[PDB]
Amino acid sequence: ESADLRALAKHLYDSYIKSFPLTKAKARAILTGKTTDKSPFVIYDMNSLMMGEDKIKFKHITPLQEQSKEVAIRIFQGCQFRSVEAVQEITEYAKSIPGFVNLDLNDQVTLLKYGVHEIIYTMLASLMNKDGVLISEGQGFMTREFLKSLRKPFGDFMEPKFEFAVKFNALELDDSDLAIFIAVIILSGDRPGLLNVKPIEDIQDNLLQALELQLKLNHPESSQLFAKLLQKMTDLRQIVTEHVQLLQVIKKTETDMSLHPLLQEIYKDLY
Numbered sequence: 728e729s730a731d732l733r734a735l736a737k738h739l740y741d742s743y744i745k746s747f748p749l750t751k752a753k754a755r756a757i758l759t760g761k762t763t764d765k766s767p768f769v770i771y772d773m774n775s776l777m778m779g780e781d782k783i784k785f786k787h788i789t790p791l792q793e794q795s796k797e798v799a800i801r802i803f804q805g806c807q808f809r810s811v812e813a814v815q816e817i818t819e820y821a822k823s824i825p826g827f828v829n830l831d832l833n834d835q836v837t838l839l840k841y842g843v844h845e846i847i848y849t850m851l852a853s854l855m856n857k858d859g860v861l862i863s864e865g866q867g868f869m870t871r872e873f874l875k876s877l878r879k880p881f882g883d884f885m886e887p888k889f890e891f892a893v894k895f896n897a898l899e900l901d902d903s904d905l906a907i908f909i910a911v912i913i914l915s916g917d918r919p920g921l922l923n924v925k926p927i928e929d930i931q932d933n934l935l936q937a938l939e940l941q942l943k944l945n946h947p948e949s950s951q952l953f954a955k956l957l958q959k960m961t962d963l964r965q966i967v968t969e970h971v972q973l974l975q976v977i978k979k980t981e982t983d984m985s986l987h988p989l990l991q992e993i994y995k996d997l998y
């Protein structure tokens with residue numbers, strides 16, 4: 728019934744607020760000009776990239792990769808580092824979805840493993856506009872053209888995300904909508920190697936109802952927003968497979984690669 732669907736929507740939105748530091752609301756403000764405390768440092772070329780990394784050096788030190796390697800790869804490892812952090816926030820959020828923790832532990836792993844990237848790219852869109860993407864928790868803004876200049880391999884790993892983002896952001900979803908959308912993505916019963924599909928689908932069915940109600944109430948005038956949003960799920964899935972193909976190419980043609988352990992777990996045998 729409706730009351731429970733709304734309570735489910737709010738539960739998810741609250742845990743979403745607690746699990747993810749940089750929400751779309753905060754992100755759009757920064758990208759717009761609101762919040763009077765700092766303007767994002769913009770990296771649009773190699774000089775600015777240097778100045779950006781220097782400023783980070785004026786500050787304390789953090790276990791990362793303080794250059795001596797190629798730009799395209801530092802940037803590449805930078806995204807992966809941020810992804811490791813994302814996996815932890817997303818996993819915490821996943822555990823807040825009613826029913827999730829009670830699913831077979833193996834399926835939780837599988838759902839997480841296949842849904843984490845689709846969620847990372849969904850959340851990333853919130854930090855992107857047609858010209859760039861926020862980095863360092865809003866501290867910075869790296870341009871789309873700069874990312875597209877990196878040597879060919881790495882020069883085009885973000886372009887598909889930007890293209891998806893522009894389309895996705897045109898739906899103008901807010902955080903309360905995204906929180907439910909993300910839950911629907913995690914609770915996908917079509918993931919490879921699932922042992923108990925039934926339990927997963929019943930949870931997703933409730934999530935879908937809650938999402939539909941949310942979009943109708945929060946966006947009364949947006950015609951077929953629900954259906955359009957569900958279709959974006961095909962694009963997200965494609966972005967992930969593309970990315971995995973690009974990772975294979977790199978592993979096959981780069982001297983060496985090196986992927987963070989947590990990411991190694993996620994990528995080990997994935998679509």
Ligand SMILES: CN(CCOc1ccc(C[C@@H]2SC(=O)NC2=O)cc1)c1ccccn1
Nearest residue numbers: 802805806807809810847860861862863869
């Ligand atoms: C926050 N930014 C913005 C771009 O942000 C991302 C792009 C792709 C991912 C997915 C990663 S990259 C990989 O191979 N596997 C993954 O899970 C995650 C974030 C940066 C950009 C440069 C340096 C540090 N930070």
